[PDB]
């Protein structure tokens, strides 16, 4: 499992950038303010991992 | 003692007369359009006329014309049956009847504060469609009703425009100051920022007086002063269209914990700038010449409409960034008689 880890981390990075990057973001109207659920959902998939 | 502008159409002859071009915007209240009509008859039948004031909307970005799509909405449409086969004349109005004769007939309108000036988007190159912006149109139609299909043939069209100028009362200094705190402890840093006024005239210099007090043992690498430019789209969603109409990238070295205060010269204007698609511009009748977007002001109790311009000066020091932003107003001040509408020479 520990592998398993280490090979996940990569993915883990990922979910952090993207958090960050959504986080940048979270005010931007376009697409109906489809920035907004963008934020949450990477909010909410950052909490349950 | 005065003179107007005048349009025609081939089938019916139908000479729609306008005061003026342009229609200024007090705060309160819009100045009336005004205008006559000249209707002979080309027909036995058909004796309606109606005139139609469109407050057009129209917009697109580069990627939304990739992919396919523009957005266009009709902010204000007013129908007026011009001609009686209500509406009491006015001074110019009589003036032009008096001149014109009998079939002479008025048509009055009167633009609800707070719809937005007629600003339009700087087409790109490649852009050569309807030109994107807030767009004032007024038409004739020599129909019955609405039933019959808009006929080319009868119908004239005229651009206007909705401008608003400077007030006198210059309005409170912009000026803004902050001071963050390093990560080592809690170090200060202060930087402080003036503008001459609130109001400046298009092409007029801008006196930024910076100052900078640095209580840290770190040093100032740059200072960028820019004039930024914020175009608030209101319909769609569509996001604040931000971009930078000047700067000085002046690079200044100050001692640690040490004070340094002068004053950085900015000055708007298009030859510079005449490339950043999208650029908010006040309005163009067709395609002419015309400066930035005059800063539109909401001083009424309002409503977010239309493509809202203004106009913030961004000072930012490097070592990250301490940024602050001097927002101000960018507008014509009041003119003698009238803009010309195009280039003052013509070639």
Same mark, same amino acid.
């Given at each position: 499992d520990s592998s398993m880890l280490i090979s996940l981390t990569y993915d883990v990075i990922?979910?952090?950038? *993207?958090?960050?990057?959504?986080? %940048?973001?979270? %005010? *931007?109207?376009?697409?109906?303010?489809?920035?907004?659920?963008i934020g949450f959902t990477m909010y909410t998939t950052c909490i349950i991992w | 003692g005065t003179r107007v502008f005048k349009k025609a159409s081939p089938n019916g002859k139908l000479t729609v007369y306008l005061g003026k071009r342009d229609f200024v915007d007090h705060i309160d209240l819009v100045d009336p359009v005004d205008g006559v009509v000249l209707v002979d008859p080309e027909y036995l039948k058909e004796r309606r006329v109606y005139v139609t004031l469109?407050?057009?909307?129209?917009?697109?970005?580069?990627?939304?014309?990739v992919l396919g799509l523009t957005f266009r909405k009709d902010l204000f449409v007013a129908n007026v049956?011009?001609?009686?086969?209500? &509406?009491?004349?006015?001074? =110019?109005?009589?003036?032009?009847?008096?001149?014109?004769? @009998?079939?002479?007939?008025p048509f009055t309108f009167e633009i609800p504060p707070n719809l937005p000036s007629s600003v339009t988007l700087q087409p790109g190159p490649e852009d050569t469609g309807k030109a994107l912006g807030v767009?004032? +149109?007024? &038409?004739?139609?020599?129909? @019955?009703?609405? +039933? $019959?299909?808009?006929?080319?043939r009868n119908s004239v069209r005229l651009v206007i425009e909705k401008?608003?100028?400077?007030? $006198?009362?210059?309005?409170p200094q912009p000026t803004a $100051?902050?001071?963050?705190?390093?990560?080592?402890?809690?170090?200060?840093?202060?930087?402080?920022?003036? =503008?001459?006024?609130e109001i400046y005239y298009h092409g007029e210099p801008i006196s930024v007086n910076v100052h900078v007090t640095n209580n840290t043992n770190k040093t100032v690498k740059k200072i960028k002063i820019?004039?930024?430019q914020y175009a608030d789209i209101v319909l769609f969603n569509t996001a604040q269209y931000k971009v930078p109409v000047a700067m000085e990238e002046a690079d200044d070295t100050v001692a640690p914990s040490s004070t340094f205060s002068k004053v950085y010269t900015l000055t708007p204007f298009l030859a510079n700038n005449r490339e950043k698609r999208g650029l908010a511009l006040d309005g163009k009748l067709k395609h002419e010449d015309t400066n930035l977007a005059s800063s539109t002001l909401l001083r009424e109790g309002r409503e977010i409409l239309g493509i809202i311009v203004s106009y913030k000066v961004k000072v930012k020091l490097v070592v990250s960034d301490v940024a602050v932003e001097l927002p101000?107003? =960018?507008?014509? !001040?009041?003119?003698? $008689? +009238?803009?010309?509408?195009?280039?003052? !020479? @013509?070639?």
């Open positions: 990922l979910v952090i950038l *993207c958090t960050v990057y959504a986080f %940048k973001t979270r %005010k *931007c109207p376009e697409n109906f303010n489809e920035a907004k659920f | 469109t407050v057009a909307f129209r917009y697109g970005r580069e990627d939304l014309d049956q011009s001609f009686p086969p209500k &509406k009491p004349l006015t001074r =110019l109005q009589e003036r032009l009847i008096k001149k014109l004769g @009998e079939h002479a007939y767009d004032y +149109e007024v &038409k004739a139609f020599v129909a @019955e009703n609405l +039933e $019959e299909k808009i006929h080319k401008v608003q100028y400077a007030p $006198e009362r210059p309005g $100051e902050t001071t963050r705190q390093f990560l080592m402890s809690d170090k200060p840093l202060h930087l402080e920022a003036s =503008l001459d006024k820019s004039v930024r101000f107003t =960018l507008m014509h !001040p009041k003119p003698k $008689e +009238e803009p010309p509408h195009r280039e003052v !020479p @013509e070639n």
